[PDB]
Amino acid sequence: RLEREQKLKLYQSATQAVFQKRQAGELDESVLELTSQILGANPDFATLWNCRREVLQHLETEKSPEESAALVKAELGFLESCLRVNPKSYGTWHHRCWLLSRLPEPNWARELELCARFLEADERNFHCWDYRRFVAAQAAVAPAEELAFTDSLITRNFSNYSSWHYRSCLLPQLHPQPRLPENVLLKELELVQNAFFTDPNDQSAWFYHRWLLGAGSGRCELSVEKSTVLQSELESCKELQELEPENKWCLLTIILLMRALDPLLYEKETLQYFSTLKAVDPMRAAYLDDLRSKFLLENSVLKMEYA
Amino acid sequence: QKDVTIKSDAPDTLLLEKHADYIASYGSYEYCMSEYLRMSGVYWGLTVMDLMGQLHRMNKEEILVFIKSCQHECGGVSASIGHDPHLLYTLSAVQILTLYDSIHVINVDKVVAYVQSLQKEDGSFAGDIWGEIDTRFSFCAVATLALLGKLDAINVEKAIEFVLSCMNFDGGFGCRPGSESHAGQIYCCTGFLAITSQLHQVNSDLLGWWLCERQLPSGGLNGRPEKLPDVCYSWWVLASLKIIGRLHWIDREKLRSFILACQDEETGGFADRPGDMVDPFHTLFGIAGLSLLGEEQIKPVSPVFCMPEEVLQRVNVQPELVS
Ligand SMILES: CN(C(=O)[C@H](Cc1cnc[nH]1)NC(=O)OCc1ccccc1)[C@@H](Cc1ccccc1)C(=O)N[C@@H](Cc1c[nH]c2ccccc12)C(=O)NO
Ligand SMILES: [Ca+2]
Ligand SMILES: [Zn+2]
């Protein structure tokens, strides 16, 4: 308690000191000193990151190339130390981006490795994924390399929502149309199916799978291979349903598969599965009723299309 | 899987009088450490007091002077005196002045010029002169301008194009193009799309599903898959659902019980989760959540602006929602 009273007065005094120096136009290393003592514990104090940038911008004008490189290397170390303490601060990640974007010869390979390290610690850190995308763009890293990165992350352990998300963005880049190709789609279906049969509680694979089911070319355009793959998925989900009777993701996916295969032919079973799913996932009853209503309306329209 | 377990002696009734008392006395260690967001802190306190019918217990004249002293020569508003201007605190300031019907306390023309100056060629907005790009700031920009009646000052079509480029495979939105979906970002982007009349471009059934899957067995909502529930993500999720006409897709009673369990019966205020330390941020979002769920003791709240609807009716800024 008294230590907090100590820290508070130390931050307070350092803060006043920085503001005081700022009005005076004293853009020097003493400010870097003061802010380092505040930003470590309080990285969300954005005005202090602004002060550091004003100081660094000022100092580069009135110092040698070698002196400015030294200041930049000291900044990279300070930033890394801040990130280790709080890897989820917008201000710290932005300052690192601001810094790297103005360097003459930035080492992007080192930055990609920084990202790999932080993603080992927290594979869901969206600040780090965002930074990695920034570095990948700057360094002109190809989508295929990043696709390789995501697979290792997905297979080596769980916590995969962020990795699947990244794939959803990378795949369309490997096949850019101004809606994935079927060969690509079939491979992704295989990969994601492994995922949710490895961990059927992992919601992330199920969310990505629902996307892949929509990313096709249509039910009356079903190829023999895709038709067979989806029917196989359907049977494999029924298998899982036996092993995990409380698993709602597999029940929803069964409904979605029957939709993808033949809405009218599977109408009976679709309605049966809605009843089971609502029993198993009652908090979603309202959602499921609206989905069922939408499906029954689609079916009425399909039936009226009859010649 | 990851969830909280609510205990059977958790509060189960709304303690409004205690909440007004808590906010009325707030700011008489963490207070001084959060001075970098003071303007937003003031907004949270005033808005929740107004939702509870208690705004008069706050100090209007003192806040109006503080706001004027936080507007910089460039037109932007800072979080506190001597701090730097930012879109976040510019919005907060304008929300406060709207609550108080005192917009001409600051220089509106310069606010408009500041917001206008932060738009980039791709339609995005930086938060300030240092260039951080985030859909949060697209929302701050249009919400600020909407409240001032000056939405026409920015490039709206390019702003729309940028926000839509942030829409993801799952129907949600992230910070920037390619960023992962997050409830906070979804709230900002659906708010943005409500203000700019573009809700028809949202896949409401897909996003609605992603949002209702945020509800955990405890009744609380998380902000993305595999995270613990929190009384504030609970708010971003519900406001987004209301904007897209899918509020009924969550279990209202279970969520209401979770929110009420986050109250501190002794001190007043809400915490992020039951038993934790309260703060004005979670007090606002807990009370705002309860209002959206139809709590009679609380004023109707705008899901777009998180201000009382009666205030928005007054300035005639009421975005049409999906339903
Ligand atoms: C900067 N903030 C945060 O980082 C919080 C942290 C937190 C929340 N719950 C537990 N910890 N995070 C947060 O508010 O997430 C919000 C958000 C909003 C939009 C996009 C992404 C994230 C919070 C404050 C805070 C800090 C630390 C601890 C608790 C609250 C914050 O200021 N959020 C902003 C979010 C925001 C951005 N634009 C807005 C427009 C209207 C309303 C809100 C906002 C806010 O409420 N402004 O008025
Ligand atoms: Ca008063
Ligand atoms: Zn919270």
XYZ file of C-alpha atoms and ligand atoms in Angstrom:
680
model
C 0.000 0.000 0.000
C 2.790 2.405 0.997
C 4.797 1.097 -1.985
C 1.895 2.065 -4.286
C 2.033 5.487 -2.606
C 5.762 5.431 -3.471
C 5.235 4.379 -7.106
C 2.378 6.883 -7.586
C 4.486 9.832 -6.401
C 7.378 8.609 -8.588
C 5.164 8.421 -11.709
C 3.523 11.740 -10.768
C 6.872 13.514 -10.372
C 8.312 11.957 -13.549
C 5.134 12.889 -15.447
C 5.255 16.538 -14.318
C 8.961 16.602 -15.148
C 8.340 15.372 -18.711
C 5.483 17.837 -19.326
C 7.627 20.624 -17.866
C 10.557 19.740 -20.166
C 8.166 19.574 -23.132
C 6.811 23.129 -22.818
C 10.433 24.325 -22.535
C 11.274 22.635 -25.866
C 13.837 20.416 -24.150
C 13.682 17.529 -26.624
C 16.551 15.496 -25.175
C 17.585 12.118 -23.717
C 16.459 13.156 -20.222
C 12.882 12.802 -21.542
C 13.672 9.321 -22.881
C 14.911 8.516 -19.367
C 11.787 9.816 -17.629
C 9.310 8.204 -20.005
C 11.061 4.820 -19.828
C 10.270 4.836 -16.081
C 6.566 5.488 -16.782
C 5.870 3.615 -20.048
C 7.143 0.297 -18.621
C 4.305 0.144 -16.085
C 1.855 2.334 -18.010
C 2.213 1.606 -21.759
C -1.273 2.989 -22.531
C -0.142 6.548 -21.673
C -0.144 7.514 -25.372
C 1.053 11.140 -24.985
C 4.347 9.811 -23.580
C 4.881 7.631 -26.694
C 4.272 10.856 -28.672
C 6.965 12.611 -26.591
C 9.474 9.838 -27.326
C 8.830 10.192 -31.064
C 9.287 13.995 -30.863
C 12.575 13.473 -29.016
C 13.844 10.811 -31.461
C 12.824 12.913 -34.471
C 14.600 15.952 -32.980
C 17.756 14.062 -31.970
C 18.300 12.528 -35.425
C 18.570 16.029 -36.949
C 21.343 17.095 -34.557
C 23.337 13.834 -34.269
C 25.566 11.651 -36.431
C 24.441 8.576 -38.412
C 26.220 6.340 -35.874
C 24.669 8.194 -32.917
C 21.171 7.859 -34.453
C 21.611 4.127 -35.148
C 22.576 3.698 -31.477
C 19.404 5.521 -30.363
C 17.308 3.299 -32.649
C 18.888 0.074 -31.358
C 18.265 1.278 -27.778
C 14.640 1.969 -28.761
C 14.188 -1.572 -30.156
C 15.435 -3.016 -26.853
C 13.214 -0.751 -24.783
C 10.194 -1.753 -26.891
C 10.925 -5.464 -26.572
C 11.224 -5.087 -22.787
C 7.882 -3.235 -22.721
C 6.244 -5.934 -24.865
C 7.446 -8.736 -22.554
C 5.660 -7.025 -19.644
C 2.507 -6.139 -21.609
C 2.194 -7.760 -25.063
C -1.345 -6.367 -25.575
C -0.753 -2.579 -25.618
C -1.801 -0.722 -28.805
C 0.664 2.068 -28.055
C 3.763 -0.122 -27.808
C 3.018 -2.087 -30.975
C 2.326 1.159 -32.870
C 5.591 2.776 -31.730
C 7.526 -0.266 -32.992
C 5.750 0.002 -36.370
C 6.399 3.776 -36.478
C 10.064 3.075 -35.686
C 10.636 0.277 -38.234
C 8.799 2.187 -40.988
C 11.380 5.012 -40.880
C 14.593 2.909 -40.674
C 17.018 3.003 -43.621
C 17.807 -0.700 -43.492
C 15.313 -2.544 -41.280
C 15.931 -6.210 -40.446
C 12.510 -7.647 -41.286
C 13.660 -11.248 -40.737
C 14.377 -10.393 -37.098
C 10.903 -8.855 -36.771
C 9.202 -11.976 -38.188
C 11.100 -13.988 -35.573
C 9.904 -11.629 -32.828
C 6.352 -12.413 -34.005
C 6.972 -16.178 -33.985
C 8.260 -15.878 -30.401
C 5.262 -13.875 -29.175
C 2.829 -16.202 -30.953
C 4.506 -19.145 -29.194
C 3.584 -17.402 -25.935
C 0.046 -16.394 -27.031
C -1.224 -17.708 -30.370
C -4.313 -15.492 -29.997
C -2.502 -12.157 -29.578
C -4.175 -10.163 -32.345
C -1.675 -7.270 -31.893
C 1.149 -9.657 -32.795
C -0.695 -11.189 -35.761
C -1.421 -7.648 -37.015
C 2.251 -6.749 -36.597
C 3.247 -9.939 -38.437
C 1.008 -8.995 -41.388
C 2.646 -5.539 -41.402
C 6.150 -7.086 -41.436
C 5.156 -9.664 -44.087
C 3.874 -6.885 -46.366
C 6.928 -4.627 -45.804
C 9.300 -7.553 -46.419
C 7.227 -8.792 -49.398
C 6.776 -12.269 -47.883
C 4.658 -14.438 -50.204
C 1.249 -15.877 -49.175
C 2.596 -19.424 -49.643
C 5.261 -18.907 -46.934
C 2.655 -17.575 -44.487
C 0.338 -20.492 -45.334
C 3.158 -22.851 -44.293
C 3.521 -20.910 -41.019
C -0.196 -21.297 -40.156
C -0.322 -25.093 -40.692
C 2.505 -25.701 -38.204
C 0.671 -23.553 -35.654
C -2.668 -25.359 -36.230
C -1.223 -28.888 -35.953
C 1.324 -28.287 -33.125
C -1.356 -27.242 -30.597
C -4.858 -25.773 -30.113
C -5.949 -22.112 -29.690
C -6.357 -21.939 -33.473
C -9.024 -19.311 -34.246
C -6.389 -16.726 -35.224
C -4.456 -19.173 -37.404
C -7.617 -20.318 -39.275
C -8.568 -16.685 -39.722
C -5.193 -15.949 -41.299
C -5.683 -18.894 -43.692
C -9.086 -17.525 -44.732
C -7.270 -14.359 -45.873
C -4.192 -16.050 -47.396
C -5.998 -18.670 -49.530
C -7.890 -16.102 -51.635
C -4.495 -14.436 -52.301
C -2.965 -17.643 -53.691
C -5.984 -17.806 -56.013
C -6.991 -14.155 -56.567
C -10.243 -13.576 -58.475
C -11.521 -10.014 -59.031
C -15.089 -18.359 -53.859
C -12.141 -20.834 -53.810
C -11.146 -23.276 -56.593
C -12.530 -26.779 -55.932
C -9.097 -28.498 -55.653
C -8.050 -25.957 -53.007
C -11.440 -26.292 -51.293
C -11.208 -30.101 -51.074
C -7.720 -29.904 -49.514
C -8.959 -27.342 -46.946
C -11.982 -29.510 -46.141
C -9.609 -32.396 -45.463
C -7.356 -30.264 -43.220
C -10.231 -28.794 -41.203
C -11.975 -32.184 -40.881
C -8.777 -33.604 -39.326
C -8.831 -30.638 -36.968
C -12.339 -31.120 -35.618
C -11.979 -34.919 -35.481
C -8.745 -34.358 -33.519
C -10.479 -31.881 -31.165
C -14.267 -31.819 -31.603
C -14.621 -29.231 -28.834
C -12.495 -26.711 -30.794
C -15.090 -24.219 -32.068
C -12.582 -22.624 -34.484
C -12.394 -25.488 -36.982
C -16.231 -25.660 -37.066
C -16.508 -21.919 -37.823
C -13.947 -22.200 -40.629
C -15.673 -25.324 -41.976
C -19.008 -23.460 -42.207
C -17.223 -20.875 -44.377
C -15.770 -23.574 -46.682
C -19.280 -25.034 -47.129
C -20.379 -21.637 -48.505
C -17.218 -21.015 -50.564
C -18.258 -23.608 -53.204
C -20.023 -23.424 -56.562
C -23.562 -24.656 -55.635
C -25.618 -27.787 -54.875
C -26.776 -28.522 -58.453
C -23.131 -28.020 -59.484
C -21.848 -30.705 -57.075
C -19.092 -32.717 -58.752
C -18.984 -36.467 -58.095
C -15.888 -36.002 -55.886
C -17.302 -33.123 -53.819
C -20.669 -34.879 -53.519
C -18.844 -37.966 -52.196
C -16.619 -35.964 -49.837
C -19.604 -34.128 -48.305
C -21.575 -37.383 -47.910
C -18.485 -38.832 -46.205
C -18.281 -35.792 -43.897
C -21.956 -36.296 -43.138
C -21.383 -39.902 -42.046
C -18.260 -38.994 -40.068
C -20.217 -36.305 -38.161
C -22.940 -38.828 -37.306
C -20.092 -41.014 -35.987
C -18.828 -38.152 -33.784
C -22.426 -37.483 -32.667
C -22.414 -40.988 -31.123
C -19.082 -40.412 -29.359
C -20.124 -36.916 -28.172
C -23.937 -36.699 -27.715
C -23.665 -33.204 -26.141
C -21.516 -31.764 -28.987
C -23.621 -29.049 -30.614
C -21.108 -28.123 -33.354
C -21.375 -31.531 -34.964
C -25.211 -31.394 -34.939
C -25.264 -27.961 -36.607
C -22.716 -29.132 -39.159
C -24.850 -32.179 -40.033
C -27.751 -29.786 -40.783
C -25.464 -27.580 -42.891
C -24.094 -30.572 -44.809
C -27.595 -31.809 -45.680
C -28.364 -28.287 -46.912
C -25.210 -28.359 -49.040
C -26.194 -31.779 -50.433
C -29.986 -31.701 -51.075
C -32.377 -29.489 -49.024
C -35.622 -31.159 -50.125
C -34.413 -34.774 -49.960
C -33.108 -34.267 -46.401
C -35.999 -32.102 -45.131
C -37.225 -34.799 -42.721
C -33.821 -35.370 -41.179
C -33.054 -31.639 -41.092
C -36.135 -30.999 -38.944
C -35.203 -33.932 -36.692
C -31.716 -32.534 -36.200
C -33.106 -29.071 -35.341
C -35.055 -30.636 -32.468
C -32.027 -32.516 -31.113
C -29.776 -29.472 -31.446
C -32.207 -27.174 -29.608
C -32.336 -29.714 -26.757
C -28.543 -29.811 -26.651
C -27.962 -26.038 -27.127
C -31.007 -24.267 -25.556
C -29.354 -20.807 -25.337
C -29.320 -20.780 -29.150
C -32.994 -21.879 -29.485
C -34.016 -18.499 -30.945
C -31.193 -18.525 -33.494
C -31.974 -22.118 -34.444
C -35.691 -21.380 -34.900
C -34.869 -18.472 -37.230
C -32.418 -20.665 -39.178
C -35.006 -23.412 -39.470
C -37.593 -20.848 -40.601
C -35.202 -19.536 -43.284
C -34.517 -23.101 -44.451
C -38.253 -23.977 -44.581
C -38.817 -20.841 -46.689
C -35.959 -21.839 -49.056
C -37.578 -25.290 -49.327
C -40.994 -23.810 -50.204
C -39.310 -21.821 -52.991
C -37.488 -24.959 -54.250
C -40.788 -26.897 -54.308
C -42.552 -24.101 -56.240
C -39.749 -24.249 -58.871
C -41.125 -27.669 -59.899
C -42.348 -27.923 -63.506
C -15.086 -24.120 -22.477
C -13.431 -21.267 -20.496
C -16.177 -19.671 -18.396
C -16.886 -18.301 -14.913
C -19.004 -20.141 -12.352
C -21.457 -17.805 -10.617
C -22.041 -18.532 -6.928
C -25.528 -18.704 -5.422
C -25.046 -15.651 -3.179
C -24.151 -13.453 -6.174
C -26.354 -10.340 -6.352
C -29.636 -11.031 -8.195
C -31.368 -7.640 -7.909
C -30.548 -4.233 -9.450
C -28.862 -1.880 -6.942
C -29.390 1.415 -8.772
C -29.218 3.710 -5.714
C -25.824 2.169 -4.818
C -24.568 2.607 -8.378
C -25.494 6.314 -8.463
C -23.791 6.760 -5.071
C -20.666 4.976 -6.348
C -20.395 7.123 -9.477
C -21.362 10.348 -7.632
C -18.426 9.801 -5.225
C -15.892 8.565 -7.805
C -12.585 10.451 -7.855
C -12.925 11.989 -4.379
C -4.080 5.040 -7.037
C -5.884 3.940 -10.212
C -7.533 7.293 -10.657
C -4.224 9.012 -11.184
C -2.876 6.185 -13.349
C -5.773 6.480 -15.778
C -5.486 10.249 -16.417
C -4.523 9.409 -20.028
C -8.223 8.462 -20.569
C -9.840 10.999 -18.217
C -12.172 12.503 -20.843
C -13.570 9.020 -21.554
C -13.840 8.330 -17.809
C -15.953 11.467 -17.477
C -18.142 10.315 -20.389
C -18.703 6.880 -18.766
C -19.714 8.449 -15.438
C -22.030 11.088 -16.875
C -23.706 8.681 -19.302
C -24.457 6.063 -16.667
C -25.766 8.742 -14.280
C -28.053 10.046 -17.012
C -29.302 6.523 -17.811
C -30.138 6.224 -14.091
C -31.813 9.684 -13.958
C -29.044 11.105 -11.738
C -27.040 13.376 -14.075
C -27.772 16.451 -11.912
C -25.569 15.015 -9.147
C -22.479 15.544 -11.343
C -20.759 18.929 -11.832
C -21.789 20.322 -15.219
C -20.012 23.669 -15.061
C -16.729 22.099 -13.929
C -16.798 19.541 -16.787
C -17.593 22.191 -19.432
C -14.498 24.187 -18.395
C -12.350 21.024 -18.436
C -13.558 20.158 -21.949
C -12.784 23.668 -23.269
C -9.278 23.473 -21.784
C -8.745 20.084 -23.521
C -9.428 21.354 -27.048
C -6.174 21.983 -28.861
C -5.397 24.669 -31.457
C -5.702 22.019 -34.229
C -9.307 21.414 -33.087
C -8.847 17.946 -31.563
C -9.566 17.190 -27.913
C -7.177 15.478 -25.493
C -7.957 13.102 -22.612
C -6.797 15.625 -20.044
C -5.085 18.984 -19.735
C -1.612 18.854 -21.240
C -2.149 15.528 -22.997
C -2.267 15.231 -26.777
C -5.435 15.339 -28.914
C -6.923 12.124 -30.221
C -10.105 10.998 -32.001
C -11.072 8.867 -29.016
C -11.293 11.859 -26.623
C -12.707 14.122 -29.292
C -15.660 11.699 -29.514
C -15.979 11.444 -25.744
C -15.943 15.245 -25.419
C -18.657 15.621 -28.058
C -20.788 12.919 -26.434
C -20.531 14.797 -23.092
C -21.461 18.165 -24.660
C -24.376 16.455 -26.401
C -25.584 15.044 -23.052
C -25.358 18.605 -21.697
C -26.692 20.449 -24.805
C -23.510 22.563 -24.764
C -21.758 21.811 -28.069
C -20.779 25.436 -28.610
C -18.557 25.289 -25.519
C -15.920 24.119 -28.024
C -14.993 25.199 -31.532
C -17.107 22.910 -33.725
C -15.595 24.068 -37.035
C -12.140 23.147 -35.779
C -13.385 19.716 -34.523
C -14.733 19.047 -38.022
C -11.425 20.150 -39.593
C -9.466 17.876 -37.222
C -11.599 14.815 -38.035
C -11.466 15.614 -41.774
C -7.641 15.876 -41.562
C -7.226 12.328 -40.203
C -8.858 10.506 -43.125
C -6.423 8.681 -45.400
C -6.495 8.040 -49.157
C -8.000 4.563 -48.668
C -10.899 6.002 -46.600
C -9.503 4.950 -43.226
C -8.896 7.176 -40.224
C -5.770 7.561 -38.107
C -6.405 8.160 -34.404
C -4.122 11.181 -34.408
C -1.154 12.718 -36.264
C 1.040 9.663 -35.517
C -0.912 7.537 -37.919
C -2.314 4.453 -36.117
C -5.114 3.085 -38.357
C -8.060 1.277 -36.734
C -11.782 0.838 -37.500
C -12.344 2.176 -33.952
C -11.315 5.549 -35.429
C -13.674 5.251 -38.431
C -16.429 4.956 -35.851
C -15.089 7.835 -33.713
C -14.952 9.996 -36.827
C -18.525 9.393 -38.080
C -20.072 9.288 -34.588
C -18.462 12.654 -33.789
C -19.566 14.200 -37.086
C -23.105 12.719 -36.846
C -23.538 14.334 -33.410
C -22.375 17.704 -34.841
C -24.515 17.359 -37.972
C -21.412 17.354 -40.171
C -21.149 13.813 -41.607
C -20.868 15.406 -45.064
C -17.393 16.766 -44.165
C -15.605 13.454 -44.816
C -15.322 11.131 -47.798
C -18.142 8.795 -46.809
C -18.006 6.325 -49.712
C -14.243 5.800 -49.248
C -14.817 5.464 -45.484
C -17.472 2.800 -46.178
C -15.137 0.982 -48.606
C -12.397 0.826 -45.969
C -14.699 -0.516 -43.250
C -16.140 -3.128 -45.592
C -12.580 -4.216 -46.526
C -12.254 -5.183 -42.836
C -15.117 -7.702 -42.996
C -14.036 -11.299 -42.430
C -14.903 -14.905 -43.353
C -17.042 -15.222 -40.221
C -19.122 -12.083 -40.931
C -17.254 -9.956 -38.385
C -14.750 -7.098 -38.536
C -11.205 -6.485 -37.281
C -8.985 -3.378 -36.713
C -7.600 -3.231 -40.251
C -7.895 -5.265 -43.438
C -6.945 -8.865 -42.663
C -7.436 -8.444 -38.875
C -9.294 -11.106 -36.924
C -12.916 -10.563 -35.812
C -13.386 -9.128 -32.315
C -16.639 -7.927 -30.597
C -15.200 -4.449 -29.937
C -14.399 -3.990 -33.626
C -17.752 -5.416 -34.624
C -19.485 -2.846 -32.388
C -17.482 0.003 -34.015
C -18.043 -1.248 -37.548
C -21.776 -2.024 -37.162
C -22.148 1.377 -35.419
C -20.276 2.952 -38.338
C -22.524 1.172 -40.865
C -25.657 2.241 -38.960
C -24.553 5.892 -39.022
C -23.699 5.780 -42.732
C -26.878 3.821 -43.697
C -25.029 0.695 -44.928
C -26.399 -2.091 -42.699
C -27.703 -3.919 -45.778
C -24.025 -4.772 -46.514
C -23.651 -6.782 -43.290
C -24.461 -10.494 -43.409
C -26.745 -10.258 -40.380
C -27.483 -13.995 -40.136
C -23.790 -14.956 -40.266
C -22.503 -12.193 -37.965
C -25.521 -12.642 -35.732
C -24.571 -16.285 -35.240
C -20.930 -15.464 -34.469
C -22.178 -12.930 -31.877
C -24.732 -15.163 -30.170
C -22.072 -17.903 -29.924
C -20.253 -15.444 -27.596
C -22.732 -16.410 -24.863
C -21.294 -18.933 -22.390
C -23.122 -21.351 -20.050
C -22.703 -18.790 -17.238
C -24.881 -16.419 -19.329
C -22.058 -13.915 -19.853
C -20.630 -12.942 -23.222
C -17.002 -13.028 -24.363
C -15.422 -10.885 -27.108
C -14.122 -13.727 -29.230
C -13.772 -17.510 -29.152
C -11.981 -19.049 -26.173
C -12.013 -15.955 -23.947
C -13.553 -15.468 -20.523
C -16.855 -13.550 -20.335
C -16.786 -9.931 -19.246
C -19.584 -7.522 -18.470
C -18.267 -5.106 -21.139
C -17.834 -7.530 -24.033
C -21.281 -8.455 -23.039
C -22.217 -4.856 -24.017
C -20.389 -4.685 -27.370
C -21.975 -7.958 -28.359
C -25.546 -6.935 -27.403
C -25.372 -3.523 -29.015
C -24.058 -5.073 -32.219
C -26.873 -7.656 -32.135
C -29.453 -4.939 -31.590
C -28.039 -2.892 -34.497
C -28.339 -5.882 -36.849
C -31.805 -6.844 -35.527
C -30.719 -10.099 -33.821
C -30.838 -9.256 -30.086
C -33.292 -12.131 -29.470
C -30.567 -14.629 -30.482
C -29.083 -14.579 -26.971
C -30.687 -15.862 -23.768
C -31.746 -12.560 -22.185
C -32.478 -13.981 -18.751
C -29.163 -15.811 -18.399
C -27.272 -12.672 -19.506
C -29.272 -10.455 -17.189
C -28.367 -12.758 -14.262
C -24.698 -12.656 -15.249
C -24.678 -8.838 -15.424
C -26.475 -8.493 -12.055
C -23.915 -10.900 -10.547
C -21.109 -8.487 -11.505
C -22.439 -5.809 -9.106
C -20.701 -5.094 -5.807
C -23.444 -5.120 -3.163
C -21.319 -3.224 -0.608
C -19.597 -0.483 -2.640
C -21.855 -0.301 -5.704
C -20.447 -0.344 -9.242
C -20.020 -3.304 -11.626
C -16.838 -5.359 -12.180
C -15.781 -7.179 -15.374
C -16.780 -10.444 -13.697
C -18.508 -11.449 -10.436
C -16.431 -10.808 -7.337
C -13.863 -8.562 -9.042
C -13.076 -4.914 -8.330
C -15.623 -2.469 -9.774
C -14.934 0.546 -11.989
C -16.973 3.216 -13.824
C -16.204 1.671 -17.260
C -17.924 -1.616 -16.338
C -20.622 0.226 -14.435
C -21.650 2.051 -17.591
C -21.530 -1.062 -19.757
C -23.359 -3.229 -17.181
C -26.153 -0.648 -16.837
C -26.264 -0.024 -20.608
C -26.519 -3.780 -21.233
C -29.459 -4.057 -18.806
C -31.266 -1.209 -20.581
C -30.927 -2.895 -23.999
C -32.387 -6.021 -22.372
C -35.394 -3.852 -21.365
C -34.782 -2.911 -17.721
C -37.614 -0.546 -16.641
C -35.630 1.477 -14.049
C -33.048 2.517 -16.678
C -33.577 4.932 -19.592
C -33.557 3.460 -23.121
C -29.984 3.541 -24.447
C -28.830 4.008 -28.043
C -26.995 0.876 -29.220
C -25.038 3.070 -31.682
C -23.968 5.996 -29.437
C -24.278 4.467 -25.928
C -26.136 7.549 -24.777
C -29.762 7.883 -23.678
C -32.071 7.741 -26.721
C -33.907 10.835 -25.412
C -30.680 12.784 -25.951
C -30.333 11.535 -29.541
C -34.011 12.289 -30.235
C -33.274 15.856 -29.076
C -30.448 16.345 -31.622
C -32.403 14.265 -34.170
C -29.622 11.723 -34.812
C -31.234 8.291 -34.735
C -29.772 5.781 -37.225
C -32.274 3.292 -38.637
C -31.299 -0.226 -37.522
C -31.994 -3.611 -39.128
C -34.829 -4.422 -36.633
C -8.686 1.366 -23.815
N -9.699 0.475 -23.197
C -9.348 -0.828 -23.168
O -8.289 -1.242 -23.644
C -10.341 -1.841 -22.572
C -9.683 -2.766 -21.550
C -10.681 -3.724 -20.874
C -11.975 -3.905 -21.153
N -12.455 -4.830 -20.325
C -11.469 -5.225 -19.528
N -10.377 -4.544 -19.867
N -10.717 -2.585 -23.757
C -11.773 -2.220 -24.451
O -12.516 -1.298 -24.108
O -12.053 -2.911 -25.587
C -12.825 -2.028 -26.479
C -12.746 -2.031 -27.844
C -13.617 -1.196 -28.541
C -13.542 -1.183 -29.915
C -12.610 -1.982 -30.562
C -11.741 -2.813 -29.864
C -11.807 -2.835 -28.487
C -10.988 0.978 -22.646
C -10.801 1.530 -21.218
C -10.200 0.519 -20.238
C -8.820 0.449 -20.076
C -8.264 -0.462 -19.184
C -9.093 -1.311 -18.452
C -10.478 -1.243 -18.615
C -11.027 -0.324 -19.506
C -11.541 2.093 -23.555
O -11.222 3.268 -23.376
N -12.365 1.673 -24.527
C -13.018 2.571 -25.513
C -13.582 1.733 -26.675
C -14.143 2.579 -27.826
C -13.521 2.918 -28.953
N -14.336 3.653 -29.715
C -15.499 3.793 -29.091
C -16.678 4.446 -29.421
C -17.766 4.427 -28.552
C -17.678 3.749 -27.347
C -16.503 3.091 -27.022
C -15.415 3.115 -27.887
C -14.133 3.371 -24.808
O -14.991 2.832 -24.102
N -14.084 4.678 -25.039
O -14.993 5.533 -24.491
Ca -24.860 19.285 -10.394
Zn -14.346 -5.403 -19.707
